[PDB]
């Protein structure tokens, strides 16, 4: 975001206002007849700016507009926010959650985890099982794993709406107890409900494709797709 | 695996009459161990379970974006508004005997992903099989019935 | 891909409630929680069965059938 001096309010303020946001949602909902207002519309009006790592060296960026921009009792449950005690910002972050990649945007509350666990989940999400494409029935891919009943997560991130994760999910909302029940779940094991497995919990399809080809090595050195007989093969 | 790096295999499968159950008759689909939590310090697993419980009760899907102003206390208040214990614990009953479990169990939905490391694609045994052409040792790979 | 017949944990038959759930949503203007409570899904297992279900079946029916009679 672009932070301008904004002498009308007497302090620095984002050039984006509620009118631009309203135009954006108007365009987005009309996509689902007014003037088209796109990302490039914001780009051409000086509202947002593209910054790389060299240009990051000479700017000051705010975390949130509603916190760090206006001039400065607190809820004890919230995390401690430092306002940095300085108002000379040139830019503001669009959203801090956008620093994550595709895989890490699937993690619910990644700021409440130890970071190696987030790295493990980012590596593990590629091994998840679910619908990868809607045309899986017409693709003869070598290996294909498709869940029976994919479910969108109950705890879902705002970011994964843009990854279409609510349309092509990769897991199920399982009712989970955290218990030392019978000593059969100790130290990274689970006890899964067999009745739930009977009703289709985590049941999945597996497609394997076998490709075979007949080739001519010369004039008569070739092969034919045919059913062999014990008399002559 | 969960969405938090808490992977693992199925130890055993119980039928519904053997698993623990709430006063509402809800059995878990899956039981994990408490020992996965403190060493890994995976708090977001618990918060996701709490928020998913509140989401399932209220019908609105939970906002689990990282840097929002969503606290555990607000989720606890919402869960208490639904007539459940605010920290997600439930009074469970033993499947085998029907007695109350002396310690209450943290309960609720949690989004789990099936991973591709199926045991049937990995179990492998060989008493005698084909030889390598050169070294005359057992061949490589479970697909070729290897050593 | 299509609505499951029974709830995974308890086994309440929820496969007959999907189209009625859609009716309670899209023309009755009810929120999702009142829609599930209208169908009698009082345990949250059934609620996450219907609420979290994604219907890929319409995305699959958009393709032209492979064998057309």
């Amino acid at each position: 975001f672009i932070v301008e001096d904004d002498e009308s309010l007497g302090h620095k303020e984002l050039k984006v206002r509620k009118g631009h946001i309203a135009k954006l949602m108007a365009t987005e909902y009309q996509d689902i007849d007014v003037e088209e207002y796109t990302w490039s519309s914001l780009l051409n009006e000086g509202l947002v700016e593209y910054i790389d790592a060299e240009e990051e060296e000479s700017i000051l960026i705010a975390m949130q507009p509603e916190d760090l921009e206006p001039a400065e009792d607190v809820d004890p449950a919230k995390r401690i926010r430092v306002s940095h005690h300085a108002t000379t910002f040139t830019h503001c972050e669009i959203h801090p959650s956008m620093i994550l990649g595709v895989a890490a945007s699937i993690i619910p509350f990644p700021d409440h985890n130890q970071s190696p666990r987030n790295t493990y989940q980012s590596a593990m999400g590629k091994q998840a099982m679910g619908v990868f494409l809607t045309n899986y029935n017409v693709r003869m891919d070598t290996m294909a794993n498709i869940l029976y009943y994919p479910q969108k997560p109950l705890g879902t991130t705002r970011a994964m709406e843009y990854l279409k994760f609510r349309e092509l999910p990769a897991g199920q909302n399982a009712i989970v107890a955290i218990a030392c029940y019978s000593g059969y779940n100790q130290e990274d094991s689970m006890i899964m409900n067999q009745s739930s497995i009977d009703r289709g919990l985590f049941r999945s399809l597996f497609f394997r494709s076998y490709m075979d080809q007949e080739k001519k090595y010369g004039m008569s050195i070739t092969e034919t797709f045919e059913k062999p007989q014990r008399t002559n093969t | 695996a969960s969405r938090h790096g808490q992977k693992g295999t199925i130890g055993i499968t119980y039928r519904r009459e053997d698993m623990p159950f709430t006063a509402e008759g809800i059995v878990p689909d899956l039981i994990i161990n408490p020992h996965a939590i403190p060493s890994r310090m995976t708090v977001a697993h618990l918060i996701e379970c709490l928020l998913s419980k509140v989401a399932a009760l209220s019908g609105n899907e939970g906002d689990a974006s990282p840097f929002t102003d969503i606290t555990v206390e607000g989720i606890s208040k919402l869960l208490r508004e639904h007539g459940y214990q605010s920290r997600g614990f439930e009074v469970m009953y033993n499947g085998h005997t029907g007695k109350k479990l002396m310690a209450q169990i943290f309960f609720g939905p949690t989004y789990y992903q099936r991973l591709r490391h199926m045991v049937d694609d990995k179990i492998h045994a060989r008493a005698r099989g084909p030889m390598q052409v050169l070294t005359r040792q057992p061949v490589e790979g479970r697909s070729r019935d290897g050593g | 891909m299509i609505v499951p017949v029974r709830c995974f944990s308890c086994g309440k038959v929820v496969g007959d409630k999907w189209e009625s759930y859609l009716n309670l949503l899209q023309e009755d203007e009810l929120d999702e929680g009142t829609a599930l409570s209208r169908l009698g899904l009082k345990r949250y297992c059934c609620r996450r069965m219907i609420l979290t279900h994604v219907d890929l079946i319409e995305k699959f029916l958009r393709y032209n059938p492979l064998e057309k009679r």
């Binding site: 909902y29 705002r158 | 609105n60 899907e61 906002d63 929002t68 102003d69 606290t71 607000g74 | 929120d31």
Partner: peptide, 19 residues
């Protein structure tokens, strides 16, 4: 506290109401 729910349909209807 803030509402911990992604409920974007209802402001869709609200924004259509302002429209």
């Amino acid at each position: 506290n803030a509402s911990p729910f992604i409920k974007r349909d209802r402001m869709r209807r609200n924004f259509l109401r302002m429209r």
